[PDB]
Design a binder for this molecule. Sequence first.
Ligand SMILES: *[C@@H]1O[C@@H](C)[C@@H](O)[C@@H](O[C@@H]2O[C@H](CO)[C@@H](O)[C@H](O)[C@H]2O)[C@@H]1O
Ligand SMILES: *[C@H]1O[C@H](CO)[C@@H](O)[C@H](O)[C@@H]1O
Ligand SMILES: *[C@H]1O[C@H](CO)[C@@H](O)[C@H](O)[C@@H]1O
Ligand SMILES: *[C@H]1O[C@H](CO)[C@@H](O)[C@H](O)[C@@H]1O
Ligand SMILES: *[C@H]1O[C@H](CO)[C@@H](O)[C@H](O)[C@@H]1O
Ligand SMILES: *[C@H]1O[C@H](CO)[C@@H](O)[C@H](O)[C@@H]1O
Ligand SMILES: *[C@H]1O[C@H](CO)[C@@H](O)[C@H](O)[C@@H]1O
Ligand SMILES: *[C@H]1O[C@H](CO)[C@@H](O)[C@H](O)[C@@H]1O
Ligand SMILES: *[C@H]1O[C@H](CO)[C@@H](O)[C@H](O)[C@@H]1O
Ligand SMILES: *[C@@H]1O[C@@H](C)[C@@H](O)[C@@H](O)[C@@H]1O
Ligand code: NA
Lengths: 206, 105
Amino acid sequence: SVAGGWGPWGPVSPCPVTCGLGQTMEQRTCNHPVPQHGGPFCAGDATRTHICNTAVPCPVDGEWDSWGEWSPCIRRNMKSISCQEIPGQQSRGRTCRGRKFDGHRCAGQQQDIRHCYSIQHCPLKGSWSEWSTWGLCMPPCGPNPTRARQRLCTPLLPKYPPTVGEKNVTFWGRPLPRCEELQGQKLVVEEKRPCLHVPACKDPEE
Amino acid sequence: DPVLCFTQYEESSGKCKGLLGGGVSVEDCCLNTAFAYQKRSGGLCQPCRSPRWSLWSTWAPCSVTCSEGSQLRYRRCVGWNGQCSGKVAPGTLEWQLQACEDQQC
Ligand SMILES: *[C@@H]1O[C@@H](C)[C@@H](O)[C@@H](O[C@@H]2O[C@H](CO)[C@@H](O)[C@H](O)[C@H]2O)[C@@H]1O
Ligand SMILES: *[C@H]1O[C@H](CO)[C@@H](O)[C@H](O)[C@@H]1O
Ligand SMILES: *[C@H]1O[C@H](CO)[C@@H](O)[C@H](O)[C@@H]1O
Ligand SMILES: *[C@H]1O[C@H](CO)[C@@H](O)[C@H](O)[C@@H]1O
Ligand SMILES: *[C@H]1O[C@H](CO)[C@@H](O)[C@H](O)[C@@H]1O
Ligand SMILES: *[C@H]1O[C@H](CO)[C@@H](O)[C@H](O)[C@@H]1O
Ligand SMILES: *[C@H]1O[C@H](CO)[C@@H](O)[C@H](O)[C@@H]1O
Ligand SMILES: *[C@H]1O[C@H](CO)[C@@H](O)[C@H](O)[C@@H]1O
Ligand SMILES: *[C@H]1O[C@H](CO)[C@@H](O)[C@H](O)[C@@H]1O
Ligand SMILES: *[C@@H]1O[C@@H](C)[C@@H](O)[C@@H](O)[C@@H]1O
Ligand code: NA
């Protein structure tokens, strides 16, 4: 009897998000005229979508950076504990980065604390390590890729108690290990060799 | 330069998902740091979150079929509005080259 027809596009609905971009739309209805006694419904789209900008930035939650370096091993009210069987303490921190527009602060510990022994600048007896495994080829994209392994004068650490409220005590600091000369070196012996049949570094998106 | 804006970024794959559409700046897309964008031409999907290194790719296969060769892998500074380790810009690749031998040949 009567074929459906679309009415006019209505107004744009309010943006459904409270920050950044969203999808809004305008709608129309098959009522101009409404279908009657078996007449067809309207062909095509009842909806037409748009991107809407709120122009408002969303909150950004903070995120922990990685731990900073351990502070020096020291004991409150002792001038110097290095090269001595005297536990100290040290701490390291990390920063909540990127927190913005009322985003969440980070959850968890900001500061890390432990007992240490100081062997900072402490001369120790060393023995030579076996070869390391071959390192990476350097430079990986430059013209001369060469890989290396090394033997190191390894310090012999003092037989101090590992724990001492019974808590772990960690050696900290760069000692000065004393070795027999090996191939004219007192600390590091290095081997190099070229990497063979070197590929070219190509951005996989190019 | 207008981009394609996605509602979702997939960390594991680094894929853009849930296209909002085009005709938007990165600036507007990334008002929501949960969003991701792509150039109209295609290629690298960038998340709107702050820049951080991607995981190393698996090792690419041995430059030679049975002799000693080498093989590459990479990671990328991926994100927006900042820099990765070593004052580095989003999109920047870092490469590692490993010595390689496929079979005892
Ligand atoms: C409405 O007000 C805004 C200031 C935000 O707080 C909105 O929350 C945000 O909602 C979007 C979804 O559109 C999420 O992606 C954001 O992560 C969330 O912060 C709030 O709905
Ligand atoms: C509504 O949609 C289009 C007009 O824009 C046509 O398919 C027909 O007028 C329909 O009822
Ligand atoms: C809605 O869209 C356009 C105008 O926005 C016209 O073709 C007509 O008004 C339609 O109903
Ligand atoms: C600090 O703690 C360890 C490394 O000591 C890791 O979980 C990570 O680097 C964190 O920032
Ligand atoms: C402190 O502990 C050791 C050095 O003794 C390393 O894991 C790192 O330097 C950390 O900050
Ligand atoms: C160096 O280390 C010890 C002695 O310092 C020995 O295993 C050997 O001399 C090595 O070359
Ligand atoms: C390194 O070189 C070989 C092993 O590759 C041996 O002579 C020994 O392990 C040395 O440390
Ligand atoms: C370097 O050479 C061989 C072959 O890659 C390695 O397997 C080994 O670890 C050495 O350091
Ligand atoms: C690549 O290097 C190692 C694993 O091979 C990890 O530190 C991490 O997966 C990184 O992205
Ligand atoms: C690649 O396959 C290996 C097994 C060797 O036969 C090579 O010579 C060949 O090119
Ligand atoms: Na000490």
